[PDB]
Subunit: 761 residues, 3 copies
């Protein structure tokens, strides 16, 4: 997790200001009043968890399926924007009519030189993909994907009444995707919708051509409708010359929505009553995270009012459509009440009783089991591979994670984190300007870390507010998405609490008063200073969502919070291949234990191995790291290094002996935290394996030199706890979770303190 | 909502869709913020009908063939 | 807005264009506006009528039936 001050926050982390999204640049705080009331449809969203595997290649074909696939592909960062995927796709099937030969040759597969026409059909369907790999020689395909696409028309079932088999399909694993959207994500949505406008007609045409085909004869003679097949689809491809223009339409519905927001009356911003109605927008005004997307792209690209729309006809064609009313996005529009709620609340009491520890937190049970893949490549001799799930490290390590599936529950974490509770004297005097604002989400880490980037750098970029901006455009991307997902998540969750919101320019640089933020209100909070407001008027009135967050009364989490976890043995006997890599290849790696007693080096040196007790190596497998399982413990890692370096900065600053007592107790209580945690980690059964076996090895080392064979001399007290960590080290790296540069940290922190048991055991 | 309700369970557990029930209807109540404005629309179809009646040619009273249909 | 997107592609229809362009100049009444409604006018046309014996035509064959030497 992670925390801020309650009074200050901009001096703690600029990223959660509305102002930073507004690009206010650290200076003046937003406050400007003169307000317009709102309401909630609790706003459009995504899913949150959707780990599943589509079938393709079975010849059913449905654009909504592929839309997810390309969308996920960009979410894999396989190229970049979906829009790029699409323009490059059209660049691909600019091999459109310039290649009649696609028909002439696939029909040649139908056998062929079909001027020798007849009810020729016999058998063969399901792998034109290879003869179409010859079509890849005809249609080179640096991407696997569209090459894997085009097969379908000839072989969805065509000719639907024979050809014939498949008895086989294909594969891909969509994972859960991004939680909340943005400019690029949206244009990717509507772009995916132009593709939606593509493929469905592309199926329907053939769907009727087949009706007009088997005139009988039987399937009738070729070099015709077959030789047709998709020429009409090419015309359908030419029906696709003009959907819209994604950035323009998105910017359009955007800024017109903003005009619907802004106080600014005049003709530049006068949403016509001629069209203030007309469906959709009437609830679409209510969406609010979508509104965050507004202020976001308003932040990046100014406003750039192309206003492709008129005032009414047609201010209709442009908002004919948008992403939620697309199914093309994994993301989906959202009903009324729950918003996206699933976080409880508690708050510190000094019997006064203003909070000093805000408690806002997670809600999430991590995977109970994970399974290794055996990369049995054989077909194609390239990317094509089979994984064949089988038990291995799997079952046993999983059962060992079950206790971790208890003792590292988030509820227990925050509950202990809440137990930090009493601090700076007593009791009853803990208050002093700011107060800690602890928080964190399952999502931001589960995704940004899934991209393999280490979220904490972005987190710190938020903490300083200002972007490091030295990153690769890829990392530039992960940073951006990190930002608006943090921010917006906090926004619309905070919104999920407080019922009412009002629009607020800002002013400052105006830059034409279109720039704007929000201010909120609640009353129940006790007459105490809190944030800039205090509470002022018996009511909040704050720009800043965190402020409304702090005042909220304690509650409970709602969502099923489960990791759901994938399975695939079915699809595995089916596979085939897909962009899978990221796992990656060789399931684990050794870590080397060491210790000294009687002033002698020993170095236990253990692998990897199954370690569990059946050799050897194994080999080969690789298991996926759960995003979640490492993400959560990384939240805590962020806490560890947080209290470490920051309160060490306190060790540097306030040299007051009482403040000395504070840094003492706090750093040494995170110390007792990881202490007792690894402590319970050592009792784990694999931990038991590491204990007995590594101890067996170094006892064998005792037998090395003949005089230090004088029985065990390690065991007294300190050594046991001292090696107890080693169990937490196997549980660390190559348990499939922690990423090293970690035990590193833990080592230094375990050096920071006396540790000991500290008692128990 | 009822179709999405008795997830079963049986009728499924409350403090939810029940606690929902009509919040969406309140949003439906908010779908009703703007039908038209009665006197204005009535006066509108009215007087445009009157322009369809009146001999007066000019632009103030020229029922568009664009929409006489 | 539909139709015209493939309707642009028709070409004998285009011959009809250059033809009546030949007889009656162009005489741009332009009963249409630029958009609303440049819709009502091309709401409809002859091929999308069944009223004509004539009918709209698919993709490839055109009206082919002559060999060559």
């Amino acid at each position: 997790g992670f925390n801020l001050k309650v009074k200050d926050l901009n001096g703690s982390a600029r990223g959660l200001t509305q102002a930073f999204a507004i690009g206010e640049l650290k200076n003046q705080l937003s406050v400007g009043a003169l307000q317009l009331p709102l309401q909630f449809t609790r706003t459009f969203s995504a899913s949150m968890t959707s780990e599943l595997l589509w079938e393709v290649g079975k010849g059913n074909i449905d654009p909504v399926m592929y839309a997810r696939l390309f969308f996920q592909y960009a979410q894999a960062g396989g190229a970049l924007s979906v829009d790029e995927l699409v323009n490059q796709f059209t660049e691909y099937h600019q091999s459109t009519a310039c290649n009649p030969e696609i028909w002439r040759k696939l029909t040649a597969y139908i056998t062929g030189s079909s001027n020798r026409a007849i009810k020729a059909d016999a058998v063969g369907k399901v792998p034109p993909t290879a003869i179409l790999e010859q079509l890849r020689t005809l249609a080179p395909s640096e991407h696997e994907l569209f090459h894997h696409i085009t097969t379908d028309f000839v072989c969805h079932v065509l000719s639907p009444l024979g050809f014939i088999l498949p008895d086989a399909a294909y594969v891909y694993r969509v994972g859960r995707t991004a939680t909340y959207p943005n400019f690029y994500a949206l244009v990717d949505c509507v772009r995916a919708s132009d593709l939606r406008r593509m493929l469905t007609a592309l199926s329907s045409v053939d769907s009727k051509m087949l009706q007009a085909t088997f005139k009988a004869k039987g399937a009738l003679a070729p070099a015709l409708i077959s030789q047709h097949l998709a020429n009409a689809a090419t015309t359908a491809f030419e029906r696709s010359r003009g959907n819209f223009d994604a950035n323009a339409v998105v910017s359009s519905v955007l800024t017109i929505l903003g005009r619907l927001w802004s106080p600014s009356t005049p003709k530049e911003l006068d949403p016509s009553a001629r069209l203030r109605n007309t469906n959709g927008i009437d609830q679409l005004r209510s969406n609010l995270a979508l509104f965050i997307a507004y202020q976001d792209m308003v932040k990046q690209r100014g406003r750039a009012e192309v206003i492709f729309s008129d005032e009414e006809l047609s201010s209709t064609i442009i908002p004919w459509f948008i992403e939620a009313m697309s199914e093309v996005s994994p993301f989906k529009l959202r009903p009324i009440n729950e918003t996206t709620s699933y976080i409880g609340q508690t708050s510190a009491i000094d019997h006064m009783g203003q909070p000093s520890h805000v408690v806002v937190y997670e809600d999430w049970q991590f995977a109970k089991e994970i399974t290794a893949f055996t990369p049995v490549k054989l077909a194609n001799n390239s990317n094509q591979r089979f994984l064949d799930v089988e038990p291995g490290i799997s079952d046993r390590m999983s059962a060992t994670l079950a206790p971790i599936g208890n003792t590292f529950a988030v509820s227990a974490f925050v509950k202990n984190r809440t137990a930090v509770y009493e601090a700076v004297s007593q009791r009853g005097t803990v208050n002093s300007n700011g107060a800690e604002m602890t928080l964190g989400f399952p999502s931001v880490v589960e995704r940004d870390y899934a991209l393999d980037r280490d979220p904490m750098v972005a987190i710190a970029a938020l903490r300083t507010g200002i972007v490091d901006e030295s990153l690769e455009a890829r990392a530039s991307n992960d940073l951006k998405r990190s930002m608006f997902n943090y921010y917006a998540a906090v926004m619309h969750y905070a919104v999920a609490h407080n019922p009412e919101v009002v629009v607020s320019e800002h002013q400052g640089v105006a830059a034409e008063q279109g720039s704007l933020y929000l201010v909120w209100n609640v009353r129940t909070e006790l007459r105490i200073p809190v944030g800039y407001n205090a509470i002022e008027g018996g009511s909040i009135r704050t720009p800043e969502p965190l402020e409304a967050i702090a005042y909220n009364k304690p509650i409970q989490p709602s969502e099923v919070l489960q990791a759901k976890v994938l399975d695939l043995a079915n699809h595995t006997t089916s596979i085939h291949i897909w962009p899978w890599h990221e796992a990656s290849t060789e399931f684990a790696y050794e870590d080397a234990y060491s210790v000294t007693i009687r002033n002698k080096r020993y170095t236990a040196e253990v692998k990897e191995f199954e370690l569990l007790g059946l050799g050897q190596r194994r080999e080969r497998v690789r298991i996926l790291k759960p995003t979640v399982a490492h993400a959560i413990i990384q939240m805590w890692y962020s806490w560890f290094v947080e209290d470490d370096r920051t309160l060490a900065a306190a060790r540097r600053t306030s040299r007051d002996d009482a403040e000395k007592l504070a840094i003492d107790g706090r750093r040494m209580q995170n110390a007792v935290t990881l202490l007792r945690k690894i402590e319970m980690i050592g009792t784990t059964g694999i931990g038991a394996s590491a204990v007995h076996l590594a101890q067996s090895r170094i006892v064998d080392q005792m037998a090395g030199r003949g005089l230090i064979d004088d029985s065990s001399d390690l065991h007294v007290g300190i050594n046991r706890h001292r090696i107890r960590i080693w169990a937490g080290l196997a549980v660390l790296q190559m348990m499939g979770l922690l990423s090293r540069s970690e035990a590193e940290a833990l080592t230094k922190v375990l050096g920071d303190s006396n540790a000991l048991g500290m008692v128990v055991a």
